[PDB]
Structures are given as C-alpha cells and as structure tokens.
Design an enzyme around this catalytic site. Sequence first.
Site, PDB file in Angstrom:
ATOM      1  CB  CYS A 436     -16.360  10.335   6.752  1.00  0.00           C
ATOM      2  SG  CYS A 436     -16.581  10.816   4.571  1.00  0.00           S
ATOM      3  CD  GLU A 508     -17.762   6.376   3.490  1.00  0.00           C
ATOM      4  OE1 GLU A 508     -17.183   7.857   3.905  1.00  0.00           O
ATOM      5  OE2 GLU A 508     -17.382   5.745   3.102  1.00  0.00           O
TER       6      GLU A 508
END
Lengths: 519, 521
Positions: A436, A508
């Site tokens: 992230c 993601e």
Amino acid sequence: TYSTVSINTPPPYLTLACNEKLPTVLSIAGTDPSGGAGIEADVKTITAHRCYAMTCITALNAQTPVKVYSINNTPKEVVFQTLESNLKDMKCNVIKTGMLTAAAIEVLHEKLLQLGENRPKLVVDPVLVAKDIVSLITEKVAPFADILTPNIPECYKLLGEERKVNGLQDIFQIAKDLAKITKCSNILVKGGHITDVLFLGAEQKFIIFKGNFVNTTHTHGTGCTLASAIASNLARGYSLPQSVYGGIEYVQNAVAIGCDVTKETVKNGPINHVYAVEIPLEKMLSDECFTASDVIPGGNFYEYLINHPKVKPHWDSYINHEFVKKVADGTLERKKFQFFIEQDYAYLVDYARVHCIAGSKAPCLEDMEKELVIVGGVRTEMGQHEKRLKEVFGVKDPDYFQKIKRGPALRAYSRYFNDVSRRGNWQELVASLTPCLMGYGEALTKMKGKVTAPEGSVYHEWCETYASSWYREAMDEGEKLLNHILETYPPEQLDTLVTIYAEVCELETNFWTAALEYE
Amino acid sequence: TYSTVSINTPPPYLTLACNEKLPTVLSIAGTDPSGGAGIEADVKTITAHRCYAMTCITALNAQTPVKVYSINNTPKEVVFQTLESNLKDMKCNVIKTGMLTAAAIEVLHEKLLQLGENRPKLVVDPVLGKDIVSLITEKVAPFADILTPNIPECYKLLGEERKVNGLQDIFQIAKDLAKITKCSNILVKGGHEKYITDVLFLGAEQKFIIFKGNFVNTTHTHGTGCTLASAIASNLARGYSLPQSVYGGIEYVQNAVAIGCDVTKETVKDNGPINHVYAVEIPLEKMLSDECFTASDIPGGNFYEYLINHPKVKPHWDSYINHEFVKKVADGTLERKKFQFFIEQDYAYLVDYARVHCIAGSKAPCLEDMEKELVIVGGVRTEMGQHEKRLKEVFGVKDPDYFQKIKRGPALRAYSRYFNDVSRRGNWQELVASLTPCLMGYGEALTKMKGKVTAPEGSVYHEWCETYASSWYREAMDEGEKLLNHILETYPPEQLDTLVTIYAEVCELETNFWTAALEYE
C-alpha cells in the site's frame, strides 16, 4: 538428574463456559479408515463445529480415496446394543445417518418408534450405488427425517427414474417429488452444474445456494461432511436454512483450502476439515504464564519480493496501472475519480481499525504512537473527502456520505485486511501493509513527469502527494522495516509473507480497475 | 417462490494454509461409541490438534461412561486389510495404539518388522488379558517411542505391586519398565494444596522431567489416557520434541478436564467425558458476522452501580478498594523498596494495558467510540512517564534500558494473560468489561483516602495518592461510567452474567496485584 515443569491453568476466557452443555450429534454410519469420508469424517466435522460426537458403526470397511478395499457389515446384535446404550445414558440432539445396512435400518426404525415424540432430529444422507435398500430408507427411515441430502444420481435412484438437467425448474420438480415419496418435508439436492437447492415442504419454499466452482480432485467425503455440519448446526439450535448455509460453506472451504495427506501413488483426496482449528501448543508456549521454558524445548527483502515470480505480475499490474496514466494526462473521467475517493472514504473507518491493531502489535511504544497519529487523523481525512465532494463534485444533501455503497473490490480489500490483522502476527500485517505504501509511490515516481493535469487541480494534487520527497522518505522507512523482519522471522514461513504481499498487490489493482470501469 | 443465496469464499487468511501438509496420525484402538474414550476420542483430539486422523478399529464395543456393555473383537483379516491399505496410500507420521487384541498385535508387529526403520513414530497407550500384557511388552513396546502407563498399569507390566512412597519409587519404576519393554521413553502418570504428578523418563539421556499439574476435584475423567496419547502423537507428528509434545499433551487433557462439559443424562452422575472441544470456534458465528456474507436470512439505571453491588463482585471489589497497600502508601508506613516494585510492575502492566486498549478501539462500533480509546492510551502513557520520572528522581535509576529489562511477576502475568485472552477470543463489550476495574477501583480506593493522607506533602507517596483522587481522573471515571452503559445497550441481555463474571475475576486479579507489591521481599 531431573527437572520440574509446571502445567499451566486453562485460558481464562475459555474458563467462562465451564461444564458446557455441548450440542450432541450421533452418527450412524460406515467407516472410512483413511479418514476422508464415513464415520470418522462425521466425528471430525462434529468436532470442528464445537459439538460432541457419538458413533454407531454400521459396517467396518477397508477404504481409501483410491478404492473401497473391502466391506464388512457389523452384526445386528452389535448395532442394537451400541445404539441402545448410547441413548440410555447420553443426551442426543441430532442423529445423522450415512452408510446404512438392512440390520442397521431394522435397529434404527425400532428405536425411532420407541422414542416417538421424544426422538431427536434426523439428518439422513443417502449412501448408495455399491434395490430393497432404497425401499428400506424410503419406507423405514426417511419418514422420520428432518432433512434429506441426496445428489442427482441419488435422486434418480430414490424415485426410480432418470430426469433432466435443463434448468432450475428441473430440480424443483425432483425435490417436490422426493418429499411426497419419502414423507420428509425438507430436502437438499446437490448439483455442481455449483448449485444447491433446499426445498421447505410446509412453507412450500425454495432456497437456491450458489457456490464456487473449485477445480480439484480432492472432493472425497463432501457428502458425509455436509450432513454432519448441518446436523451440528441443527443441534446447536440454528434454523434449518441457517444450518444448511453453514454446512455448505464449511465443506466448500474445506475443499477450497484442501490438504496434502495422500501418497503420490493416489493422485482424488480428502478435504480440510481442520482449516479453522488453531494449534494448541502454539498458544501454550507463547502464553504469558508459561512458567517455565527452562526444560522445554542477500541483500534487501523489498527487491526480493518485487522480483519473486508469485508477486511479479500482480506488482507490475499495480505500479503500471492505467488509472495512474489516465489521472496524469487528465483522460480519466470526472465521475470515475469521484468513485475512487467515494470508495476510499467508505473504507476510512475500517482503515482506522486496522491501524489500531497495528499499534497494539508494534514492537515498541514509539511505533504505537506513530500508528495512533494515523488513527487520530482519519477524522480530518474523512472531512477532507467530504469537502472535496461538495466543492468539486455534487453536494446532493448532507446525508449523501452515509448512503455510499461498498463495491466488490472494496469489500474484498476490507475483508482481507480485517482477516490478516485479526488472525495474523505483526510481521504478517506489515507484509500486507507494505504494498500500500510502496506501490503508490513508485507508481507515480514513474509518472514524473509526465504530469499534464493543470497545477492546483485534484488530479495534480493526488499525483504530487505520492511523488514528493517526504513520501519517498516514508517509503525508505518502509523498506527498512521489511529488512528488519528478516532477522526476526523464521525462513520456513517466508513464503507466506510473499503470498500476502502478492495478494495485496492484486487487491490494489482490483481497487483501481473498479474505478476505471465505473458506469 | 424461490430465493438465491450466495455462498461466501473462505476467510482470506485461512487460505494461506491451502494444500496443507497436515500431520497425520493413525490410531489403532477400540471404540467407545459414547464418544468419551477410544478411537472417537482419538479422532476428536487429533482433529482438535489440527492434525489428520486415521483409524484402525481392533474392537467394536458398546460402551458408555457407565460401563462396558459388550466387547466384539474385529477379525484379524479386517485389521490386516485396514492397516495394509491405509499405509499403502496414505502418508503416516505417527501411529498411536489404544485397545489391542492378540489379532491386532500380530498384524501390527508384522507390519513394523516389514517397515523396518522407515516406519512412522509409535506412541503406545497401554489399555489393560493374560497374554496381552506380555504381547504388548515383547511384540509392540520395543518399537515404541513412548509408553504412557498409569501406576496400576505399571504394576501389570512388570508383574509386582510396588509401594510408591516418594519420587524415587516412580523414578525406579520408569527405569525398570524401560529395561523390559525396551522402550527408552516412558511417561508414568498418577502420583498423589494438591497436585497431579506425571513423570517423563528420557532413557537415552538418562534424564527425568517432572510435570506438576493442578488437581481438579471432578469425576469427569473418562478417556483421559486415550486423549493424552493422541495429543502426544499429534504433537510428535507436527515435529515437536518429545518434551514439548508431552507438555502440550498433559496441558490439553487437564484443560479439557478443568473446563469440562455437560453431555450425559441425569441418570449418569459420578462419571463423565471431557471437553475435547474447549478451543474450537463455532464456524457459523464468524460466517454470519463476516463482511462479505451477502445475505440476511434490564437494570434500574447505570450499569456501574449494578456491577459493584452484585453478590459475585462485591467481595472482590471490597478487597480491591479497601486494600491495605493503599492505606500504607497514604500512611507512609509502606517500605520504599516495595513501592518501587509496584511502580516497576505497574509500568510493565501499563505497556500491555495501552496495547489492549488499541484492540478495544479496533472492535468499537463507531469512529466516535474509537477516538475515546486513544484518549485512554494517552492517559496511560502519561502515567508511564510519571513512573519514569519517579524511578529516576526518587529511586535513582540511570540505566537507559532499565524499563525494557524489568522482570514480570506472577500477579502481573496472570492479569495481562486475562485481558489478552479476552481480546483474542472475546468481543468488544467483553474486552471493555475486562479493562474497567483498573480505571474505577484506583479512583475509588484513593477517593477513600482524601483527606486522610498522612504522607509528607510533596513526597512520592502523597503525589501518587493525589493523582487518583484528582478531578481529571474523575473525568476519566465519568467516561468509564458512560462507556459501561453504552456497552450494556449493545450486549445480549441473556449473556449479562458473562460481563459480571469477567468484572469479578479482574477485581480478584487487582487485589492480587497489590498483594504482590505489599508482600514483596
């Protein structure tokens, strides 16, 4: 000489439910020594459901995923006494049936008559196909059943006719025909073409269960285990539709995860009844009151992860996502980005829960305080999103931000991070949090620049935020942490850290691909 | 009329164990259909150990915790076929044995000879049969990696009834058994505040490990031997060392005994099965509560006052607040070294307490409720800094990493164990119920001391007494009162006793914490 070791007391939370009135399930079935199907799969599942198991072996078999080596029906006299004594002294909420012989049917029928209205609930799973045995179940056992769980072949045998697989209405009729011939109101039909149909006779209702098509040979014992899971949940006091749902999912997880337990000579296999069970010793040795353990018992990790085959295609799709490109050159539609920050907003509360756990697992209090700063700022981050959706987008009512619907990619993202934080250790959480940080940074470092969106705009703001030297510095601190966990973490468990890094990358990309596909 | 219900995917973290190379255990034993002992208990405990169970039934019995109703030996052919086919196609790490027949022994012996040194590990639990005891000794035991007899069964194996005065007698029995069974590793069990005593003799290392256990007053000890050996087998299968495997074996059994279960009829007192399942989570609970589930098919006033007046809490609440330790800090009669011990133990306690308030916030229903936990953590860290200053100013600590090297005491360990366990296994409201006593009792104990503080003005003792009698701490207590209500509104009304019991036990832990400081050195 010698040593003295002190045995610890039980976990304090587990001592709250002392003398637990456990739900009890009696399995009347044949054996599968290999432990895949039969009475042992019944006991495994019943145990896995926090229920108490009892047995009544109808046949003593030599069985393996490969073949049935031999079958030896247990003598009537033995079956009779086994059932008699168990029921005379033990509580019994549910009886579930698997392999049933003529003698076993003769004994069980006799007991079901003697018990009358005091009889326990009855889950009948048909086990047929190597004539009168189909008749005996229908005439003598199925009328007492709370539910029958046959598959389509088992259905064809029960009603003595072949049907069709054209649609749902096909199974609908078969189910209703089964309820009339067996005198059992509730029936669950199994068919992976995956689709499960529950018919509820009294209320004339149908519940269709849509599962997951898992391409595996390892489906040995699924039938025995579904019936035992249903029986377990029914014994606990759950509703039929609750317990059937609970059963189906539990088996489907056991299949989905799976286990390597056979010799390569076999190549069909058992399922993973034990995927949710924690290892006792792992918590016992790490316990705070374990007194004592005096007798018992190149180069950087980041670039290694990046270039590992398992994470490579998911990482590449992540840092080189079209979303970043379409934002850089202003191509991405106004509403597409609206979805992105609308979805990010929806997660911010759950985001805060994650970092609370991260603070609690941090190796030092200094690292805890850093994590509580992030949690402390979520308030303003939530507001900054609202101010952006009001001033730069539609401000349709103040109640708009409450009515935002979570998307599939967001849902999967949230569930993953909730699961790892709740179930995993500190380094496993870090491994999941790293993509992230690093992924966003180098996605936009590549996008410098290359920045075509007018300065001062939200598109410009977003790009520059992840491309500043301050973010790259936080990236540097991230990279260090991964390298620090190398000297703290066993090399045998290294692959799990790779897999989770890979899975977060995929999630993601999925979060980003959802925003570039929005209406 | 039809509805579509979607089945959820498995929980993401659990998938990390896909194609799990599960430890395999084959039990060769008789049945206890009532599910308390025998091969069913074996499979129960193997399953409870996250291991793959396999069976080979040597006798088909009719048995309950009342008595053995009938014994029916399985044909030698069947046992042969079961054994032969299992090992041919299944991976097997460990075999454990229970009830064995002359037929079973013959088959098993032959297989152990054929397999040679490439055979799996063997755990023999002697279930005692004139020739059987001799046949186990000569045909089965030389192949074993551990024997697990009780003292009466130790007498049956060697053939003499010995007097067990002390520990040497158990030591010698272990040594003598190893000689004739030809099994190095032996676990004698039985033995005698009361304590259970199990003795592991490691023959090759000429070494003893003595396992001292907590004696439970109960009749529910049916099938303890079968699950012990199976627990040991399961741990050995996973690749744990024998001492580790024995420790975990014994602790699981004692845990199963201590928690217990009510599964028998009222016509069955003075005998009962154990709780093999005490740590197993109920799947549906986490399944219906899951985020991607994608389906949908009392007191008069404040909760605080009710809790502190409850018959279960009162005695421990009183012993906590009216503690002599608080009286001796205010009187200045407490020794300096004892007060130092408390501050050091408290500092370490506060570390775990700060950590567990973060988890409390992670489980909180709304963001508003989460941010309140940060305020608490801030308050905890403030007090840590005060303990930090106390030891530097009053006790002359100069070592930079003195606070990282503090040894933790029994009272502290137990306390941290309690709320750690509640945060890992319980829900939000149970966690907070656990953390409340610390906040409340400290204020109330020291409000009871104003203004009877006869400790010199400006001294450590007096400064400590004022902080918890202060108004800002009263605001934290008021926050505690409000949270205690907010929790009762969301908690299932029927489950309320659980919250009471938690509060009651944490109160007991706190008096123990102050007792430890009071009685230090």
